[PDB]
């Protein structure tokens, strides 16, 4: 049948949205599978960090992002 | 044993400002050989759309169908 | 069960808004489709189908009650 | 040894994005000068730098932005 997943993909990107599928584990009352589709605006910012370990790189990245948010409200 | 806990602070501030934080560990190293991480900042989704079906795939297809109808209403 | 009444009661209690939108165009199989929006955070959106506009709305409310369970 | 600030500027010109430096008034935990550099890429890339002088902090932010542009 009509591929809504693909069509949604086209229309969402074309309107600058991102699409995230979440499969829910709990069924409906009638025993059916449930899915949530998230529409997001394009992300705000990508902040960079580097360090001697992956942990340090992550933590430095967070450092950068804190400062960025402190400045961009 | 100390220092500043950036991941926790970033967590808190992001939350009060309604952002979600995603850590991405990068494959390549810097020139001096150090690890790289990207922190991606995104907002709470505009809409979360629901779908149900007899199979997980159907639940996905119905969820998409709903999202398309919703997108029509906001565009 | 009257799902529209129950959804409305849950909304007034938990202080959010419920907006029904009767989609003018029909589904691929030619049925009445309705959309319900919850002013939750994030905003919740569910879909309903049926032989009348009333049935579509009830099914949308029904699904909205499912959505709320998912999100505690 | 290398002009990172200049190099980043040039890359910004040919890729048609802007580069903005912000000197942060608070020092880091260890007491160093702090700098943020923003790239008006989509999404906006943001890099941080640190040093004994504000100037070194800028040079390190630009250098990190060069590392950043190689992985986007």
UniProtKB/Swiss-Prot annotation, chain A:
Phenotype of gene-disrupted mutants: Larval lethal and displays miRNA processing defects. Embryos do not develop past the first instar larvae stage. Most females contain ovaries with empty germaria accompanied by one or two terminal stage egg chambers. Accumulates pre-miRNAs and displays a reduction in mature miRNAs.
Disulphide-bridged cysteine pairs: none
Places the protein is found: Cytoplasm; Cytoplasm, Cytosol
Written domain comment of the UniProt record: RNA-binding DRBM domains 1 and 2 bind dsRNA while DRBM 3 binds Dcr-1. The RNA-binding DRBM 1 and 2 domains are able to bind dsRNA independently. The DRBM domains appears to bind to the RNA duplex and then slide along the siRNA helix to the ends of the siRNA. The DRBMs display a preference for binding to the more thermodynamically stable ends of the siRNA which is enhanced by interaction with Dcr-2. This suggests that the domains may also function to pre-orientate the guide strand prior to loading into the (AGO2)-containing RNA-induced silencing complex (siRISC).
Self-association state and partner proteins as the record states: Homodimer.
Miscellaneous section: The name 'Loquacious' refers to the mutants being 'very talkative' as they display a loss of several types of gene silencing.
Organism the protein comes from: Drosophila melanogaster
Protein name: Protein Loquacious
Gene: loqs
Parent-protein start and end of this portion: 392 to 463 of 465
Domain DRBM: 3-71
Lineage: Eukaryota, Metazoa, Ecdysozoa, Arthropoda, Hexapoda
Impact when changing residue 36 to R: Decreased binding to Dcr-1
Positions of region (Sufficent for binding to Dcr-1): 2-73
Curated annotation (Swiss-Prot), chain C:
Phenotype of the disrupted gene, per the record: Larval lethal and displays miRNA processing defects. Embryos do not develop past the first instar larvae stage. Most females contain ovaries with empty germaria accompanied by one or two terminal stage egg chambers. Accumulates pre-miRNAs and displays a reduction in mature miRNAs.
Stretches assigned to the DRBM domain: 2-70
Compartments in which it is found: Cytoplasm; Cytoplasm, Cytosol
Domain of life of the organism encoding this protein: Eukaryota
Sufficent for binding to Dcr-1: annotated span: 1-72
Domain remarks: RNA-binding DRBM domains 1 and 2 bind dsRNA while DRBM 3 binds Dcr-1. The RNA-binding DRBM 1 and 2 domains are able to bind dsRNA independently. The DRBM domains appears to bind to the RNA duplex and then slide along the siRNA helix to the ends of the siRNA. The DRBMs display a preference for binding to the more thermodynamically stable ends of the siRNA which is enhanced by interaction with Dcr-2. This suggests that the domains may also function to pre-orientate the guide strand prior to loading into the (AGO2)-containing RNA-induced silencing complex (siRISC).
Other facts: The name 'Loquacious' refers to the mutants being 'very talkative' as they display a loss of several types of gene silencing.
Subunit structure: Homodimer.
Protein name per the record: Protein Loquacious
């Amino acid at each position: 049948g009509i591929d809504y997943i693909k069509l949604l993909g086209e229309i969402a990107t074309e309107n600058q949205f991102e699409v995230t599928y979440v499969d829910i584990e709990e069924k409906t009352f009638s025993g059916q599978f449930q899915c949530l589709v998230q529409l997001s605006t394009l992300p705000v910012g990508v902040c960079h960090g580097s360090g001697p370990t992956a942990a340090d790189a992550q933590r430095h990245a967070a450092q950068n992002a804190l400062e960025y948010l402190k400045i961009m409200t």
